[model samples]
Target: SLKIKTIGDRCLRQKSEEVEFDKKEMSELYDQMCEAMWASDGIGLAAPQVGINKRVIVVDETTEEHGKYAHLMVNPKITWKSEEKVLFDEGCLSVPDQNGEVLRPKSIKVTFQNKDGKYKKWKLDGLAARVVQHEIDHLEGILFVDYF
Candidate 1:
């Protein structure tokens, strides 16, 4: 599909699968998914948002303001969420322009695999942290709207 699936499409509710990094198609999927994120003018995107059902995600913090947020992750897991939290406006590519405020931790630590099949750990805060948490929810068949 050339476009992302919208909210309430049966696919968005299906839990995503672990990506097989060994598959050559994994490379292609990452490439297209990254472009799709930019295409949608989104700061992040999840494979399930495209109906792929894979635990793949790309975060675009390429903008000068959100530089700390960029990364490609596989099977991304939030290992810890800080006690501090805040309310942020949350939007999803699947849900288009409609948005709602979702309360989330102000910072987080996550562990996930890279394209090389190497696992890594990292932390992020601010809008980046918010978006990452949002993407991870997609893998679990959840949405910010559910919390709204």
Candidate 2:
């Protein structure tokens, strides 16, 4: 189970294996993460960044072209990414105020667990895709500024 904690600077090293949360804890933390993400006005956030040291994430985008699909991503990992890369302005709630251009994949496929802790796959493109990729990078200890 991943607990919702404070968002701050924490050094990230790539995990050797994928991590996941059980159902009860996943549901609880899902609510907690959404509350924190919305309160911080963040498009995405990760459990480790919040000081929980777990492999979980939350992604909710303001862009509504494809409709609003806000939810939790437990133990998220990028499976495949297009070779094409584009740079765009990115920011983090933990980083605060500062934002910069981050180069990222034009498209990506990710694997993650849903609120019930069931495995799922998503294909992301455009801004929604960017948000997911950005947050996953955070889980691996890379910030948006690293692309600058």
Candidate 3:
């Protein structure tokens, strides 16, 4: 059973491990992750937040790009950060009611493993960039509230 871990949970404090895409269940986990994120009204979710210490993340980008767009990334990291940044009062599912002003790079170039196990590099811009940056912070046991 998977449930979202809050501030008191040790699972959220540890550094998440890299994921191996050979496992068939990776897709299933992604599905469960997306459902949890949507059900909780979250824009992005990391595996550690759901009590799974794996380097997996899901971002709900459906209405922004296409009619149905969900980004499922494995082993994601920001490789290059922009000199400029943007601030948002970031809210997180794990933290519940706490919203803190967080500053993250406005744009970032990241690399991640795609569904087909290809390590592809891509650019993230605007709000999409911020959401992923926050979710990636979860993998490192950092919450948005810490910014406050």
Candidate 4:
């Protein structure tokens, strides 16, 4: 069973380990991540948020009605990002009760390994891009509060 770790957890500040390319292993964890994200009423969830220091994250922008896109990314990375920047109020499940305006790129191009461990790339914009960037920061042991 997985549990969401709150702010100040040492694991949240530690870099996540890379995940191996195992579809079965990755998928199972992805599903768990998805379930936990929804359960916590979150748009995204990172493995470190659940006290697992692995490079995995689940993002669902379906609620935004943004074409119902959901992703289970393993070892995700940002390959390119737009020069244009935008500021949005960002919050984290791990850091509750507080939100801050954070500046981020307006668009991003990312290359990542999916649940099946296959390489995937995407050009994300709007809320999708914002969410992905936020979660990707978790892989690097970054929290939204760092922008504050």
Candidate 5:
């Protein structure tokens, strides 16, 4: 199992590189990430959280409102965010033992590569949008605590 890097690790602060992975490799890695996230009881995980420093993220908002949906995204970019803002209690696996109230957009539009290597774009709202934004921040070396 890959260890999750904490606050002081430079990898957590530095931007992650874009992923260019083959299907089998992506599948294997995604599997591992899913296990890790579930093991840690996390809603989302980023490659950089495990020190891989790639623009890859897995989000399982199934525990929230959308119980049937999850996603593995590569090179995800947020194209738009709603003007409305919401305040929510946010936590990070990397920044253990601390959580904060953060303000984020209520909705977002994102573009990313799917597990099948197909490009996808979607608009998400509520907890789904929040989780996606949180993971995307990891790729840019931003932690939930940074909003504090």
Candidate 6:
């Protein structure tokens, strides 16, 4: 088995820069981060969160009750935000116990790249939407600390 190295806290905290990844590299990184997220029991993970500044995120909104909703988002850009708002007590692996209520749109439409590195658009609602927005913010150099 290949040994996987954890990206570490410094990687998550430092501001991330935009990364231009080619098709092969993007696909590999997406799978790598997704595996890391699942292994860590995390709901979602971003490229920046893993020390790579590239605009990539992997979400697996799987609960015991509901089935899995897993996907990869690359270079995601929010195209629409609903007027309705919701407050979530969000936590970050990088931030530790510093969880707080953050008001965000209940839904958002985002355009991004898929596993094939092909462009795709998706409209996410509820918790999934929040995850998408949060990951995108990370790429923009925003942290969960900005919420407080």
Q: Which number leads on TM-score? A: 3
What tens digits encode model 6's per-residue C-alpha lDDT throughout 5-103?
232445555556555648788767766777777776778777776667667788886768877556877778899999999999887655555779999
Q: Which stretches of candidate 1 lie over 4 Å from their true place?
A: 63-70
| Residue 74, model 2: Cα distance from true site in angstroms | 1.4
Write down the TM-score of every candidate.
Answer: 0.89, 0.82, 0.93, 0.92, 0.93, 0.81
lDDT of 4 at 129: 93
Error of 4 at 18 (Å): 1.4
Off by over 4 Å in 2: 1-8, 11-17, 61-69
Top-down lDDT ranking: 5, 4, 3, 1, 6, 2
**lDDT for 148 (candidate 3):** 78
Winner on TM-score between 4 and 5 is 5
> Which of the two candidates, 1 or 2, achieves a greater lDDT against the reference?
1
Predicted candidate 5: what Cα RMSD to the true structure? 2.1
Model 5, 117-147: lDDT tens digits are 9999999999889999999999888999988
- Residue 57 Cα positional deviation in candidate 5, in Å, after optimal superposition: 0.2
Question: Which model is ahead, 2 or 4, in terms of lDDT?
Answer: 4
Please list the residue runs of candidate 3 whose C-alpha ends up more than 4 Å from where it truly belongs after superposition.
64-66
> What TM-score would you give candidate 5 relative to the actual structure?
0.93
The lDDT per prediction is: 0.84, 0.73, 0.87, 0.87, 0.89, 0.74
Per residue, candidate 4 scores C-alpha lDDT tens digits across 1-148 of 7889988888988999888778888878887888888887899999999988988888885745565455888888889999999999999989999899999999999888976677999999999899999998988889999887
Q: Model 1 clash pairs?
A: none
lDDT measured at residue 90 in model 4 versus the true structure, 0 to 100: 95
Off by over 4 Å in 6: 1-21, 63-69
